Amino acid sequence: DSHKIALAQSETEMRNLSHSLAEHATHTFQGADVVLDDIVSFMKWRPHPSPVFNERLRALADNLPQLSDVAILDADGQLTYASVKPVPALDNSDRSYFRYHRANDDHTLLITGPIQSRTSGVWVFVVSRRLETTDGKFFGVVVATIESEYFSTFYKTFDLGPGGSISLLHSDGRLLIQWPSLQTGRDMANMVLFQKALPRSPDGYYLTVSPFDGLTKYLAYRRVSRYPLVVTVARTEDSVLSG
Question: Could you tell me the strand order of the sheet in which 175-179 lies?
């Protein structure tokens, strides 16, 4: 079959494409990790900068295309600095990421979402790091909002036919972004991807039904190296229809 050779190369392109998408995720989060880390350090020996720092944060944010904004919370969960202004110095100690860093001494970029951003009102995912004093006791929290448009914009650069689709998901089924629908936040754990494929392995290729448009397509997926994320690429196969 001609149709067989062509399906095999298509599977090959999909499997590579998933590999590229996974790295892009890795590199993008890494980028962000590095920046939050500059901040862990500043805070460490500057543990009370002046209102100038808000400008520094605003500069920093406008320079990371993947982070919409950045903020600091002190050791009581109170927002002390931000790239936004005015600066909403509210109490956010209820927030899970805050609770998590206060309880655990570790350096993981934490990914949390979806939540309704206390700086912009938009439903977003967010990334965060524990602040520490030179003694390394808890000192609060840098959090930054993941700019989801950064991913969808990259995702649309790919020629996938009508029906083409890319998603970025959390290892646990939470959807961070999906192209072209633009959905985000929803819980996709019932997908086959999470019920059977990921438990069996960490990619990667099979036939399935899109939950976004109901179409049948081949899907390739791959765990994102170094963060609990998964990427998926899908395309309708092609036929006829109708009747």
Answer: 175-179, 165-170, 229-236, 216-223, 203-209
